[PDB]
């Protein structure tokens, strides 16, 4: 018959037990700040269609970033706003400083705190072993928090992690694909970015949960400790799953498909072939060896699992010995 149902193994009913207005974002009444408090300074690079700007709050001369939204997507705008408000003040979550609009045209915009980011393409080349452990821990604080608040981020990738490296200051940004978790809901699998899509998205398993974000995090960890960005580089979504299978092996993939009674698109079996699981040690070479340890490999192995229920939760990840020296520091 159809696929086996699944529910999250942590934070399952957080939204069930909240007041409706916590998660019923279409009902939210937006409290608007004053557009004339902000002046746009320079456009930032956020992709071809983005409208994201460095700006200044002219009442205090603090730098901010403004994201101008397209008003056509009313329900999606309210969802992002409600999620940002629900999570504001949480650890390592970007702060929504304001929400403003043109008073006449009503074009709305989100105003974020400024982080003095170093582009990850440059930054990740310079990070030490300790730095990777530290910033992974910071991202885990943000994911445990938002998952505990009933929210899946669904677009975890380096481009959505702002790092002010000299202040060791990290923020998880771009909550525009984030969604409230409700057990049994069949979600859109056209989320995340190709290289960070979990197997559930690539095989069209819609009843996914917070654990999708842990697969994306494991992709980032692998790219950082092995200096291979992105780590799984498919040319489309089908080839993306082949790239994962050439590392994790095809047997555990077919085991996952069988466990959830997933109907695999039939061209897949041709291109997936037959691949053994590769020992993680195989990806260590001369330029990344100083970033790899037995603890890092054990931790990565526990995030990058086909079965979403078998991946570490963010809190379980924070307990892993990979972070022992970070935890003492904090
Ligand atoms: O879509 C969003 O949620 C969102 C949120 C924040 C930012 C954001 O981007 C920055 C970029 Cl790209 C460069 C630099 Cl140097 C600083 C920032 C920054 O301070 C900042 O807040 C972008 C998009
Ligand atoms: Cl969805
Ligand atoms: Cl979690």
Residue 323's nearest CA partner among 220, 170, 221, 172 is 221
Tally Cβ neighbours within 10 Å of residue 266: 7
CB proximity list for 70: less than 8 A, separation 6 or greater: none
Binding residues for ATP: 44-52, 67
The radius of gyration of the chain's CA atoms, rounded to the nearest angstrom, is: 20
Q: Are 35 and 109 in contact (CB under 8 A)?
A: yes
Q: What is the C-alpha to C-alpha distance for residues 31 and 98, in angstroms, rounded to an integer?
A: 9
Catalytic residue IDs: 155
Resolution of this entry, Å: 1.5
Identify the experimental approach: X-ray
Neighbours of ion ligand 2 (CB under 5 A): 187-188
Q: How far apart are CA 237 and CA 286, in angstroms?
A: 31
In the reported structure, the alpha carbon of residue 123 is separated from the centroid of ligand 1 by a whole-number distance in angstroms of: 16
User: Does residue 149 come out as left (phi exceeding 0), alpha (psi in the -120 to 50 range) or beta?
Assistant: alpha
Atom of ligand 1 nearest to the CA of 114: 19
Which atom number of ligand 1 is nearest to the Cα of residue 175?
3
For ligand 1, atom 1: residue with the closest CA: 174
- Quickly list DSSP for 239-300: HHHHHHHHHH-HHHHHHHHHHTT----THHHHHH---PPPPGGGG--TTTGGG--HHHHHHH
C-alpha 157 to ligand 2 mean position (Å): 18
> For residue 284, what are the contacts with CB-CB under 8 A and spacing of at least 6?
226, 292
Nearest ligand to the CA of 181 is 2
Domains defined for the chain, CATH in brackets: 6-23+115-330 (1.10.510.10), 24-114 (3.30.200.20)
Q: φ and ψ at 219, to 5 degrees?
A: -60, -40
Q: Which residues are registered as beta bridge partners of 172?
A: 93, 161
**Residues tagged in the binding site annotation:** 44-52, 67
For residue 114, which of 60, 154, 35 has the smallest C-alpha distance? 60
Tabulate helix, strand, coil % of the chain (nearest 5): 40, 15, 45
* Cis preceding-peptide flag for 230 (omega within 30 of 0): yes
315 C-alpha to ligand 3 centroid (Å): 6
In whole angstroms, give the CA distance from residue 324 to residue 175: 30
């Amino acid at each position: 018959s159809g696929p086996v149902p699944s529910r999250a193994r942590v934070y399952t009913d957080v939204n069930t037990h909240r007041p409706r207005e916590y998660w019923d974002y279409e009902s939210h009444v937006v409290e608007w700040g004053n557009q004339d408090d902000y002046q746009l300074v320079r456009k930032l690079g956020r992709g071809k269609y983005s409208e994201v700007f460095e700006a200044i709050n002219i009442t205090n001369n603090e730098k901010v970033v403004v994201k101008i939204l397209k008003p056509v997507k009313k329900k999606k705008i309210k969802r992002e706003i409600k999620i940002l408000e629900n999570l504001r003040g949480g650890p390592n979550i970007i702060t929504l400083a304001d929400i403003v609009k043109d008073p006449v045209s009503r074009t709305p915009a989100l105003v974020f705190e400024h982080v003095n980011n170093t582009d990850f393409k440059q930054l990740y080349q310079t990070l030490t072993d300790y730095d990777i452990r530290f910033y992974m821990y910071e991202i885990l604080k943000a994911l445990d928090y938002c998952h505990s608040m009933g929210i899946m981020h669904r677009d975890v990738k380096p481009h959505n992690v702002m790092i002010d490296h000299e202040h060791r200051k990290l923020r998880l940004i771009d909550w525009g694909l984030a969604e409230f978790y409700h057990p049994g809901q069949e979600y859109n699998v056209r989320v995340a970015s190709r290289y960070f899509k979990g197997p559930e998205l690539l095989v069209d398993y819609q009843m996914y949960d917070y654990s999708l974000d842990m697969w994306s995090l494991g992709c980032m960890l692998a790219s950082m400790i092995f200096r291979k960005e992105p780590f799984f580089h498919g040319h489309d979504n089908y080839d993306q799953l082949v790239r994962i299978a050439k590392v994790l092996g095809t047997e555990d993939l077919y085991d996952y498909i069988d466990k959830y009674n997933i109907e695999l698109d039939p061209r897949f079996n041709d291109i997936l072939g037959r691949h053994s699981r590769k020992r993680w040690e195989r990806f260590v070479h001369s330029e990344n060896q100083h970033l790899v340890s037995p603890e890092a490999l054990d931790f990565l192995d526990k995030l990058l699992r086909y079965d979403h229920q078998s991946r570490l939760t963010a809190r379980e990840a924070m307990e892993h010995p990979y972070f022992y020296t970070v935890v003492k520091d904090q």
